[PDB]
Design an enzyme around this catalytic site. Structure first.
Site, PDB file in Angstrom:
ATOM      1  N   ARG A   1       0.830  -1.198   0.000  1.00 47.01           N
ATOM      2  CA  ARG A   1       0.000   0.000   0.000  1.00 47.01           C
ATOM      3  C   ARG A   1       0.866   1.250   0.000  1.00 47.01           C
ATOM      4  O   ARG A   1       1.611   1.493   0.942  1.00 47.01           O
ATOM      5  CB  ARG A   1      -0.925   0.003   1.219  1.00 47.01           C
ATOM      6  CG  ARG A   1      -1.866  -1.185   1.249  1.00 47.01           C
ATOM      7  CD  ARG A   1      -2.809  -1.154   0.058  1.00 47.01           C
ATOM      8  NE  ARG A   1      -3.596  -2.377  -0.069  1.00 47.01           N
ATOM      9  CZ  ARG A   1      -4.077  -2.821  -1.228  1.00 47.01           C
ATOM     10  NH1 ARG A   1      -3.850  -2.138  -2.343  1.00 47.01           N
ATOM     11  NH2 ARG A   1      -4.783  -3.940  -1.274  1.00 47.01           N
TER      12      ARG A   1
ATOM     13  N   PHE B   1       0.328   9.788   2.874  1.00 42.81           N
ATOM     14  CA  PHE B   1      -0.512   9.002   3.758  1.00 42.81           C
ATOM     15  C   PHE B   1       0.336   8.008   4.527  1.00 42.81           C
ATOM     16  O   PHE B   1       0.830   8.302   5.619  1.00 42.81           O
ATOM     17  CB  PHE B   1      -1.567   8.257   2.939  1.00 42.81           C
ATOM     18  CG  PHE B   1      -2.879   8.032   3.640  1.00 42.81           C
ATOM     19  CD1 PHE B   1      -3.080   6.905   4.420  1.00 42.81           C
ATOM     20  CD2 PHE B   1      -3.922   8.935   3.492  1.00 42.81           C
ATOM     21  CE1 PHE B   1      -4.293   6.685   5.044  1.00 42.81           C
ATOM     22  CE2 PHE B   1      -5.139   8.718   4.110  1.00 42.81           C
ATOM     23  CZ  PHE B   1      -5.325   7.592   4.887  1.00 42.81           C
TER      24      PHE B   1
ATOM     25  N   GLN C   1       2.547   0.841   3.346  1.00 40.80           N
ATOM     26  CA  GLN C   1       2.502  -0.465   3.978  1.00 40.80           C
ATOM     27  C   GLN C   1       3.484  -1.408   3.297  1.00 40.80           C
ATOM     28  O   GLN C   1       3.443  -1.580   2.077  1.00 40.80           O
ATOM     29  CB  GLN C   1       1.072  -1.018   3.907  1.00 40.80           C
ATOM     30  CG  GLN C   1       0.796  -2.186   4.837  1.00 40.80           C
ATOM     31  CD  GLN C   1       1.323  -3.497   4.303  1.00 40.80           C
ATOM     32  OE1 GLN C   1       1.389  -3.710   3.095  1.00 40.80           O
ATOM     33  NE2 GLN C   1       1.705  -4.382   5.198  1.00 40.80           N
TER      34      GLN C   1
ATOM     35  N   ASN D   1      -1.470  -4.709  10.797  1.00 39.83           N
ATOM     36  CA  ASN D   1      -2.283  -5.795  11.319  1.00 39.83           C
ATOM     37  C   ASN D   1      -3.582  -5.911  10.540  1.00 39.83           C
ATOM     38  O   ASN D   1      -4.013  -4.958   9.893  1.00 39.83           O
ATOM     39  CB  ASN D   1      -2.576  -5.577  12.810  1.00 39.83           C
ATOM     40  CG  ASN D   1      -3.039  -4.163  13.124  1.00 39.83           C
ATOM     41  OD1 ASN D   1      -2.226  -3.268  13.350  1.00 39.83           O
ATOM     42  ND2 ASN D   1      -4.344  -3.944  13.140  1.00 39.83           N
TER      43      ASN D   1
ATOM     44  N   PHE E   1       4.288  -0.437   8.341  1.00 41.08           N
ATOM     45  CA  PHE E   1       4.059   0.653   7.403  1.00 41.08           C
ATOM     46  C   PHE E   1       4.647   1.951   7.937  1.00 41.08           C
ATOM     47  O   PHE E   1       4.770   2.136   9.148  1.00 41.08           O
ATOM     48  CB  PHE E   1       2.563   0.822   7.102  1.00 41.08           C
ATOM     49  CG  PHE E   1       1.735   1.290   8.263  1.00 41.08           C
ATOM     50  CD1 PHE E   1       1.192   0.381   9.156  1.00 41.08           C
ATOM     51  CD2 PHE E   1       1.493   2.640   8.456  1.00 41.08           C
ATOM     52  CE1 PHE E   1       0.425   0.811  10.219  1.00 41.08           C
ATOM     53  CE2 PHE E   1       0.725   3.076   9.517  1.00 41.08           C
ATOM     54  CZ  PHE E   1       0.190   2.160  10.399  1.00 41.08           C
TER      55      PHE E   1
ATOM     56  N   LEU F   1      -5.430   6.283  12.424  1.00 42.37           N
ATOM     57  CA  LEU F   1      -5.103   4.892  12.730  1.00 42.37           C
ATOM     58  C   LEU F   1      -4.478   4.765  14.109  1.00 42.37           C
ATOM     59  O   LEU F   1      -3.903   3.729  14.446  1.00 42.37           O
ATOM     60  CB  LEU F   1      -4.178   4.317  11.648  1.00 42.37           C
ATOM     61  CG  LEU F   1      -2.943   5.163  11.301  1.00 42.37           C
ATOM     62  CD1 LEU F   1      -1.829   4.975  12.320  1.00 42.37           C
ATOM     63  CD2 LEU F   1      -2.452   4.823   9.908  1.00 42.37           C
TER      64      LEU F   1
ATOM     65  N   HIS G   1      -3.707   0.722  14.496  1.00 39.01           N
ATOM     66  CA  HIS G   1      -2.393   0.128  14.277  1.00 39.01           C
ATOM     67  C   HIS G   1      -1.419   0.570  15.363  1.00 39.01           C
ATOM     68  O   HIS G   1      -1.287   1.761  15.637  1.00 39.01           O
ATOM     69  CB  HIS G   1      -1.837   0.515  12.904  1.00 39.01           C
ATOM     70  CG  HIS G   1      -2.622  -0.031  11.749  1.00 39.01           C
ATOM     71  ND1 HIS G   1      -2.779  -1.378  11.519  1.00 39.01           N
ATOM     72  CD2 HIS G   1      -3.289   0.599  10.754  1.00 39.01           C
ATOM     73  CE1 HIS G   1      -3.508  -1.556  10.433  1.00 39.01           C
ATOM     74  NE2 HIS G   1      -3.831  -0.374   9.949  1.00 39.01           N
TER      75      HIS G   1
END
Length: 203
Positions: free
Chosen positions: A55, A60, A63, A102, A113, A122, A126
Protein backbone atom coordinates in the site's frame (compact mmCIF):
# COMPACT_ATOMS: atom_id res chain seq x y z
CA UNK A 1 10.11 -16.62 30.07
CA UNK A 2 10.89 -17.27 26.42
CA UNK A 3 8.30 -18.43 23.89
CA UNK A 4 10.59 -18.00 20.91
CA UNK A 5 14.37 -18.44 21.23
CA UNK A 6 16.18 -15.89 19.01
CA UNK A 7 19.66 -17.27 19.74
CA UNK A 8 21.52 -14.66 17.73
CA UNK A 9 22.20 -10.92 17.69
CA UNK A 10 19.20 -8.68 17.05
CA UNK A 11 20.24 -5.06 16.44
CA UNK A 12 17.54 -2.48 17.33
CA UNK A 13 17.95 -1.19 13.79
CA UNK A 14 17.60 -2.93 10.42
CA UNK A 15 18.16 -2.00 6.79
CA UNK A 16 15.82 -2.93 3.97
CA UNK A 17 17.47 -2.67 0.56
CA UNK A 18 14.58 -2.32 -1.86
CA UNK A 19 14.30 -2.16 -5.64
CA UNK A 20 14.22 1.62 -5.22
CA UNK A 21 17.00 2.07 -2.69
CA UNK A 22 17.50 1.38 0.99
CA UNK A 23 15.16 1.91 3.92
CA UNK A 24 16.73 1.84 7.35
CA UNK A 25 14.41 1.71 10.35
CA UNK A 26 14.45 0.82 14.00
CA UNK A 27 12.01 -0.66 16.46
CA UNK A 28 10.99 0.58 19.87
CA UNK A 29 12.90 -1.66 22.23
CA UNK A 30 12.34 1.23 24.59
CA UNK A 31 8.64 0.80 25.21
CA UNK A 32 7.46 -2.04 22.99
CA UNK A 33 8.99 -5.36 24.14
CA UNK A 34 6.82 -7.32 21.72
CA UNK A 35 6.96 -5.19 18.59
CA UNK A 36 10.74 -4.87 18.74
CA UNK A 37 11.14 -8.63 19.15
CA UNK A 38 8.66 -9.48 16.41
CA UNK A 39 10.30 -7.45 13.65
CA UNK A 40 13.78 -8.34 14.89
CA UNK A 41 12.90 -12.05 14.95
CA UNK A 42 11.67 -11.96 11.35
CA UNK A 43 14.69 -9.85 10.42
CA UNK A 44 17.25 -12.37 11.68
CA UNK A 45 15.08 -15.06 10.10
CA UNK A 46 15.07 -13.52 6.65
CA UNK A 47 11.38 -12.82 6.17
CA UNK A 48 11.65 -9.40 4.51
CA UNK A 49 13.64 -10.97 1.66
CA UNK A 50 10.30 -11.95 0.19
CA UNK A 51 8.11 -8.99 1.09
CA UNK A 52 6.86 -6.00 -0.88
CA UNK A 53 5.21 -2.64 -0.35
CA UNK A 54 1.53 -3.40 -0.74
CA UNK A 55 0.00 0.00 0.00
CA UNK A 56 1.55 3.24 -1.19
CA UNK A 57 -0.63 6.26 -0.60
CA UNK A 58 0.85 9.69 -1.29
CA UNK A 59 1.16 11.82 1.86
CA UNK A 60 -0.51 9.00 3.76
CA UNK A 61 1.30 5.78 4.54
CA UNK A 62 3.35 3.06 2.90
CA UNK A 63 2.50 -0.47 3.98
CA UNK A 64 5.36 -2.90 3.54
CA UNK A 65 5.54 -6.64 3.98
CA UNK A 66 2.92 -9.37 3.62
CA UNK A 67 4.68 -12.15 1.65
CA UNK A 68 1.32 -13.87 1.33
CA UNK A 69 -0.55 -11.02 -0.33
CA UNK A 70 -3.61 -11.75 1.80
CA UNK A 71 -3.49 -9.02 4.43
CA UNK A 72 -1.99 -10.90 7.39
CA UNK A 73 1.48 -11.71 6.07
CA UNK A 74 3.52 -14.74 7.07
CA UNK A 75 4.70 -14.48 10.68
CA UNK A 76 4.52 -18.25 11.02
CA UNK A 77 7.29 -18.29 13.64
CA UNK A 78 4.85 -17.55 16.47
CA UNK A 79 2.02 -19.41 14.83
CA UNK A 80 -1.05 -17.41 15.77
CA UNK A 81 -1.68 -13.68 15.89
CA UNK A 82 -0.74 -11.49 18.84
CA UNK A 83 -2.75 -9.38 21.29
CA UNK A 84 -3.75 -5.81 20.52
CA UNK A 85 -0.90 -3.63 21.77
CA UNK A 86 -2.69 -0.64 20.28
CA UNK A 87 -1.31 2.27 22.28
CA UNK A 88 0.80 4.95 20.58
CA UNK A 89 2.72 6.39 23.55
CA UNK A 90 4.41 8.46 20.89
CA UNK A 91 2.57 10.91 18.70
CA UNK A 92 2.40 11.70 15.01
CA UNK A 93 5.00 14.45 15.19
CA UNK A 94 5.62 14.40 11.46
CA UNK A 95 6.33 12.11 8.53
CA UNK A 96 8.40 8.97 8.91
CA UNK A 97 6.43 7.26 11.62
CA UNK A 98 7.05 3.54 11.50
CA UNK A 99 4.07 1.55 12.72
CA UNK A 100 3.10 -2.10 12.94
CA UNK A 101 0.54 -3.42 10.47
CA UNK A 102 -2.28 -5.79 11.32
CA UNK A 103 -5.43 -7.35 9.87
CA UNK A 104 -7.46 -6.71 12.99
CA UNK A 105 -7.14 -5.40 16.57
CA UNK A 106 -5.34 -8.53 17.73
CA UNK A 107 -4.66 -9.90 14.28
CA UNK A 108 -1.20 -8.36 14.36
CA UNK A 109 1.29 -9.77 11.89
CA UNK A 110 4.86 -9.32 10.71
CA UNK A 111 3.90 -6.44 8.45
CA UNK A 112 4.64 -2.75 8.98
CA UNK A 113 4.06 0.65 7.40
CA UNK A 114 5.54 4.14 7.39
CA UNK A 115 3.45 7.29 7.54
CA UNK A 116 4.09 10.08 5.05
CA UNK A 117 2.06 12.41 7.26
CA UNK A 118 0.74 12.67 10.87
CA UNK A 119 -1.68 9.76 11.01
CA UNK A 120 -4.44 10.30 13.57
CA UNK A 121 -6.82 8.11 11.62
CA UNK A 122 -5.10 4.89 12.73
CA UNK A 123 -4.08 5.88 16.26
CA UNK A 124 -6.11 3.02 17.69
CA UNK A 125 -6.12 0.76 14.66
CA UNK A 126 -2.39 0.13 14.28
CA UNK A 127 0.23 -0.12 17.02
CA UNK A 128 2.91 2.49 16.30
CA UNK A 129 6.49 1.83 17.47
CA UNK A 130 9.20 2.57 14.92
CA UNK A 131 11.57 5.19 13.50
CA UNK A 132 12.83 5.49 9.91
CA UNK A 133 16.43 6.58 9.32
CA UNK A 134 18.80 7.20 6.38
CA UNK A 135 16.03 6.37 3.94
CA UNK A 136 13.37 9.02 4.31
CA UNK A 137 14.24 10.51 0.95
CA UNK A 138 13.53 7.15 -0.63
CA UNK A 139 10.30 6.74 1.35
CA UNK A 140 9.43 10.23 0.10
CA UNK A 141 10.10 9.69 -3.60
CA UNK A 142 8.50 6.24 -3.33
CA UNK A 143 5.46 7.34 -1.38
CA UNK A 144 4.72 10.36 -3.55
CA UNK A 145 4.47 8.28 -6.72
CA UNK A 146 1.25 6.59 -7.81
CA UNK A 147 1.68 5.93 -11.53
CA UNK A 148 4.76 5.14 -13.60
CA UNK A 149 3.10 5.88 -16.92
CA UNK A 150 -0.29 6.00 -18.73
CA UNK A 151 -2.55 4.19 -16.24
CA UNK A 152 0.04 1.84 -14.81
CA UNK A 153 0.88 2.33 -11.11
CA UNK A 154 4.55 2.51 -10.17
CA UNK A 155 5.68 -1.09 -10.49
CA UNK A 156 5.63 -2.87 -7.14
CA UNK A 157 8.60 -2.06 -4.96
CA UNK A 158 9.83 -4.91 -2.79
CA UNK A 159 12.51 -5.56 -0.22
CA UNK A 160 15.33 -7.19 -2.14
CA UNK A 161 17.73 -7.73 0.77
CA UNK A 162 16.97 -7.05 4.42
CA UNK A 163 19.41 -7.59 7.25
CA UNK A 164 19.58 -6.40 10.87
CA UNK A 165 22.44 -3.97 11.49
CA UNK A 166 22.78 -0.87 13.62
CA UNK A 167 23.27 2.32 11.67
CA UNK A 168 24.12 5.05 14.12
CA UNK A 169 25.12 8.03 12.03
CA UNK A 170 27.18 11.10 12.87
CA UNK A 171 27.06 14.76 11.87
CA UNK A 172 29.08 17.90 12.40
CA UNK A 173 29.26 21.64 11.92
CA UNK A 174 32.16 23.11 13.85
CA UNK A 175 32.18 26.82 13.14
CA UNK A 176 28.89 26.90 11.30
CA UNK A 177 26.28 24.22 11.77
CA UNK A 178 23.70 26.17 9.79
CA UNK A 179 22.37 23.00 8.20
CA UNK A 180 22.12 20.07 10.57
CA UNK A 181 21.02 16.53 9.86
CA UNK A 182 23.85 15.05 7.83
CA UNK A 183 22.19 12.23 5.93
CA UNK A 184 18.60 11.02 5.89
CA UNK A 185 16.03 10.20 8.51
CA UNK A 186 12.37 10.61 9.31
CA UNK A 187 10.74 12.61 12.06
CA UNK A 188 11.04 11.65 15.72
CA UNK A 189 7.73 10.77 17.40
CA UNK A 190 9.58 9.61 20.51
CA UNK A 191 10.62 13.13 21.56
CA UNK A 192 6.97 14.21 21.64
CA UNK A 193 7.56 17.45 19.77
CA UNK A 194 6.32 18.59 16.37
CA UNK A 195 8.87 18.47 13.55
CA UNK A 196 9.02 17.28 9.95
CA UNK A 197 11.72 15.29 8.13
CA UNK A 198 11.62 17.04 4.74
CA UNK A 199 8.35 19.07 4.66
CA UNK A 200 6.44 16.38 2.73
CA UNK A 201 3.99 15.91 5.60
CA UNK A 202 3.36 19.64 6.09
CA UNK A 203 3.53 20.78 2.48
Amino acid sequence: MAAIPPDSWQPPNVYLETSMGIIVLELYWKHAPKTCKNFAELARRGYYNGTKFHRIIKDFMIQGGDPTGTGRGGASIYGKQFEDELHPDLKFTGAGILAMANAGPDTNGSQFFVTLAPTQWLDGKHTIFGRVCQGIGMVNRVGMVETNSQDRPVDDVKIIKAYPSGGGGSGGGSGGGSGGGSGDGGAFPEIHVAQYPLDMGRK
